[PDB]
Write a protein that binds this ligand. Sequence first.
Ligand code: ACO
Ligand code: ACO
Lengths: 354, 354
Amino acid sequence: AGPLSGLRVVELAGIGPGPHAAMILGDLGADVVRIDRPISRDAMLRNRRIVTADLKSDQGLELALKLIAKADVLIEGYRPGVTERLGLGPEECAKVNDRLIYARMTGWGQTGPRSQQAGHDINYISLNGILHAIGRGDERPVPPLNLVGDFGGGSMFLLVGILAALWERQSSGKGQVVDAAMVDGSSVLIQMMWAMRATGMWTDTRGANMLDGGAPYYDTYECADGRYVAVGAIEPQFYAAMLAGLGLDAAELPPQNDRARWPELRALLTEAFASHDRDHWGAVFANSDACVTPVLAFGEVHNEPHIIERNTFYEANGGWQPMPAPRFSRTASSQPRPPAATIDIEAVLTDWDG
Amino acid sequence: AGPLSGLRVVELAGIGPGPHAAMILGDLGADVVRIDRPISRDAMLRNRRIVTADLKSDQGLELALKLIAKADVLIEGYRPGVTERLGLGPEECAKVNDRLIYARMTGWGQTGPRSQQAGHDINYISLNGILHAIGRGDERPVPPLNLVGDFGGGSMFLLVGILAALWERQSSGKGQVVDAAMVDGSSVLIQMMWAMRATGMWTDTRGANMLDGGAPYYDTYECADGRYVAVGAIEPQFYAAMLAGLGLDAAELPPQNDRARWPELRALLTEAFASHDRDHWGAVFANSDACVTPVLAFGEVHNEPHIIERNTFYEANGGWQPMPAPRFSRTASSQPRPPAATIDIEAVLTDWDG
Ligand SMILES: CC(=O)SCCNC(=O)CCNC(=O)[C@H](O)C(C)(C)COP(=O)(O)OP(=O)(O)OC[C@H]1O[C@@H](n2cnc3c(N)ncnc32)[C@H](O)[C@@H]1OP(=O)(O)O
Ligand SMILES: CC(=O)SCCNC(=O)CCNC(=O)[C@H](O)C(C)(C)COP(=O)(O)OP(=O)(O)OC[C@H]1O[C@@H](n2cnc3c(N)ncnc32)[C@H](O)[C@@H]1OP(=O)(O)O
């Protein structure tokens, strides 16, 4: 029902970024067929059809190749050489379908000294300077969950690659291979810090920068109730609006960007915010441009008016799940279909006419 | 040169997610024309043509509309209502070009109680449970830079939106509006934690989970020299390789997933890692599946063999910048063109034939 209605996707069951890129294609209307090893409660596996095949057997190889022959996109997320050894490498796939967008999701990439090494999100962002930049300066770096490598710089770059190559396909009539390494994607994800490094606007020192928690106007504060607000008041008119709401006289404060007095500045904002609870500050800074919001825990998210009003989440046995993103005015995505029982691979083949 | 060679993009000069989405389109071959208010050192503005226009004047509005008439994609990142009041809203653009992908990059979205409020990355991820999930449990949440809202759940979803709509356009012959809200994108980026919350595999407690730094096998460790390694050894066989490298007898340790004894497990791993420098562990683990990697600071990234060999970065003027991601086997992206002087808008219009 969304913009990708009609798009045929073969996903080889993996973990992390592959199934997340595959979910997003399904979210937006694609026909995604997932092949697993010979009814799921993982909501990530929404908007698929699940089939099963031993890719190491002659029948399973044959069936999967017949499935790939009728597809637009193949997603795989194993080590380089794995699909090759199975007989499902790009050159074998090309033989039965040269319109195929062959999408390879890895952390290290297809080649290079580490391309055969095991790893996960934390490893990939450790090697490109990202992880070192995250957390408080007086402590060892903290992982930003797996948002940066696996998803932000992983699956999202796989999708761009995939859709980019489909655009190319319109003029050339041919697919190709998408080499999507989390180490690359995440670097492009963080290109802003690389730009700013070159002009003296970002330093290698952890938690001493504008957007890393070093700036008293770009950080969380703890309130009277042990809960938190986020302050994001970069621009001076926003910062001023923020001080107005706190009832602080600007003339009694250090300048916003005098870094030499940032501890003094923070101590004064800390005292201010500590004086009431989080919900007080949401009432105080209601419609304002102060860039002050409540830090909601996952469980409170569904009670937030802006979240509710725009239907950012829907309920699915177990709890809340995010609606497809982004939104489309003419071809709107549907609410995601729940994970369902495994179906017969043959049924899909007839459906796809193969 | 890359997959998106031929694609025409008009970017209305903004900040954060908009310019980054437009950068990535340029990286991949797109013809990107950026309109600013009446030669840049910001490497984010690579792969552009820069022109200038007062959109509030008759002349400037006319010229911009002539430019938009000839484009495939318009990127704007202002408050909802701004383009409208300029005469550049979707319904005006539709008049001159109904094939236009009109891409609206916001934090709050186009509608809702907060849609007119100022904000930055920290605010958008604060309202959807993400920011609360980030940092050590004994401390107030820390911002994961602006990686998750602006970029991972912002620009990246704008891109997917844009390219998805271009796919739709091939059958329908029409464009539409992409509503890309960082509050939506970032939720879908974190869909995994929402899936796991539903099945008891994720909790709302900060720093007490498998991927947030609560797991001793999924965290950084400080070494003898004050530098760090990242451990990512989730799977038992990797965890085992990790222990072998450390010279640790598994029989003398608590089980890997005995959470009750995670403090005791971490104290033993801490003592082990602290005994040598980062690069010793660099060496001992450089080759195995132990999921142990050095935590590199931005400045030392360009010296890492895997980074060097795959050309993840190029030097621009001054320092290193990331190469286009992902990679394409047939239509490879070029090295990005540096920011250049502003060019006259007329010249572009003749080029585009408008
Ligand atoms: C959410 C997260 O935390 S994930 C973080 C991101 N990690 C990644 O996915 C990065 C890229 N991938 C990898 O590095 C690796 O695949 C790892 C580390 C995840 C896993 O490593 P391993 O499981 O040891 O190796 P790998 O996944 O490459 O091999 C999978 C095997 O299953 C086989 N296999 C897969 N599907 C099937 C099937 N349907 N039938 C039969 N065999 C199958 C493959 O042929 C392969 O066997 P082989 O090793 O004999 O060739
Ligand atoms: C790097 C970072 O961390 S940034 C974080 C990214 N997130 C965001 O900021 C969200 C993005 N969207 C927004 O909410 C907003 O654009 C903000 C809050 C960033 C900034 O808002 P403001 O600076 O107050 O301006 P706003 O976007 O409302 O409007 C732009 C103004 O410039 C004017 N303008 C824009 N282009 C032109 C032009 N070429 N010629 C003349 N005027 C122009 C518009 O008329 C408008 O003025 P108006 O409000 O009088 O109509």
